[PDB]
Amino acid sequence: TRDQNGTWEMESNENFEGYMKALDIDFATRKIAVRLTQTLVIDQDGDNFKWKTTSTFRNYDVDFTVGVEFDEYTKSLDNRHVKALVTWEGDVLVCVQKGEKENRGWKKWIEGDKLYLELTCGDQVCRQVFKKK
Amino acid sequence: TRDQNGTWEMESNENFEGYMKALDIDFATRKIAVRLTQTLVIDQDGDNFKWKTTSTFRNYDVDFTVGVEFDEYTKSLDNRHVKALVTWEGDVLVCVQKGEKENRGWKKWIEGDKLYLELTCGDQVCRQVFKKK
């Protein structure tokens, strides 16, 4: 069949590394790229193709219980070992990440259909907002 | 509410760059990371949290018609300008990507519920397989 319509989920990817090196794609970005899974969404009508690609990366699972300190290795970020404590302040879930970096942590809470997350390291603050699907 | 169960899709991400630099995450990987969208899937039962994170990147749309050569800029790969021609060989969709790199192209076809894709540059071959969702 010539019909390639649909949603296609990558299951295998062999020698992506050598193909990328042959294209002179720099080392640091090859290192990340070979970790990705791709999903392809093909819209085919006759000899007209349109298709969208999305590269995805599954980060680490983190599970914990509020009030019980745990060890965390922040792979896929800076890869340091921190001692994380998670508590409630009212509605606000607060985590202190004891380790080399001072003032390292985050705060998480709901307002409406929005989830707010502020991540802090040193003097630096990163603010993220998510919508509920 | 303390109930943070659900699927949450990132809509905003501010000063991710400075937070990452404060964590001494190297330049090349910050450059990619600030392009990602995150989806969080939270499973909360009482004071027990489990959550999965997935970082995604939307690649470029490519649309073309078989038999009509077109210009392609391969952003999010090597960012070169190629002249791409797409033809059918039997069931097999064949693309030749005329440009600086010799023997640059790919071949795409269906066998079963699998989509096969081979990408070639120079002497190097990359083979990918997708399953139909």
Q: Per residue in A30-45, is it b (16+ CB within 10 Å) or e — as a string? A: beebeebbbbbebebe
- 3-state class of B15 per DSSP? coil
Query: Given the structure tokens 């989509």, which residue do they identify?
Result: B115
Measured between beta carbons, which residues in chain A are less than 8 angstroms from residue B103? Answer: none
d(CA A116, CA A114): 6
Superfamily of domain B1-133: Calycin beta-barrel core domain (2.40.128.20)
Cβ within 8 Å, pair A8-B115: yes
Q: Which two tokens stand for residue B48?
A: 């027990």
State how far residue A49 is from chain B, nearest Cα, in angstroms: 5
Residue in B88, B87, B132 with CA at minimum distance from that of residue B111: B132
User: From start to end of A1-133, where are the E strands?
Assistant: 6-14, 37-45, 48-58, 62-65, 70-73, 81-89, 92-98, 105-111, 114-121, 124-132
Contact A63, A25 (CB under 8 A): no
- A2 in B contact zone (CB under 8 Å): yes
d(CA B131, CA B90): 21
d(CA B47, CA A79): 26
Compute the 3-state secondary structure of chain B and give helix, strand, coil in percent, each to the nearest 5. 10, 60, 30
- B89 in A contact zone (CB under 8 Å): no
Report the residue from B11, B48, B65 with minimal CB separation from A47: B65
- A116 in B contact zone (CB under 8 Å): no
Cβ within 8 Å, pair B52-A29: no
Report the residue from A13, A29, A131 with minimal CB separation from B32: A29
CA nearest A22 in B: which residue?
B121
Spell out the domain ranges in chain A: 1-133
Task: Report the residue numbers after which chain B has a gap, meaning the C atom sits over 2.5 angstroms from the next written residue's N, or none.
Answer: none
Measured between beta carbons, which residues in chain A are less than 8 angstroms from residue B11? Answer: 129-131
Report the residue from B57, B59, B78 with minimal CB separation from A25: B78
In sequence order, the 6+-apart residues with CB closer than 8 A to the CB of B34 are: B13, B16, B17, B20
Q: Which two tokens stand for residue A104?
A: 């390292």
| Total Cβ atoms within 10 A of residue B30 | 16
Contact B37, B56 (CB under 8 A): yes
CA separation (Å) from A92 to A65, A78, A89, A118, B106?
A: 15, 25, 5, 11, 51
State how far residue B83 is from chain A, nearest Cα, in angstroms: 16
Query: Given the structure tokens 């649309």, which residue do they identify?
Result: B63
d(CA B99, CA A7): 30
State how far residue B36 is from chain A, nearest Cα, in angstroms: 9
Q: What is the DSSP letter of B2?
A: -
Q: Kind and range of the H or E element at A20?
A: helix A16-22
Q: Which two tokens stand for residue B29?
A: 């990987």
In sequence order, the 6+-apart residues with CB closer than 8 A to the CB of A15 are: B124, B125, B126, B127
What radius of gyration, in Å, describes the C-alpha atoms of chain B? 21
- B125 in A contact zone (CB under 8 Å): yes
What are A88's strand-pairing partners?
Answer: A93
d(CA B76, CA B79): 7
Instruction: Please compute, for residue A9, the number of CA atoms within 13 A of its CA located in the half-sphere on the CB side.
Output: 4
The DSSP result for B50-103, as a single string, is EEEEEEEEE---EEEETT--EEEE-TTTT--EEEEEEEEETTEEEEEEESSSTT
Q: Which two tokens stand for residue A60?
A: 């680490």
Q: What is the DSSP letter of A25?
A: -
Report the residue from B9, B54, B121 with minimal CB separation from A58: B54
Instruction: Please compute, for residue A5, the number of CA atoms within 13 A of its CA located in the half-sphere on the CB side.
Output: 7
Strands A37-45 and A48-58: what pairing?
antiparallel
Cβ within 8 Å, pair B59-A64: no
The DSSP result for A103-130, as a single string, is T-EEEEEEETTEEEEEEEETTEEEEEEE
d(CA A118, CA A109): 9
- B64 in A contact zone (CB under 8 Å): yes
Contact B60, B76 (CB under 8 A): yes
Which approach determined this entry? Answer: X-ray
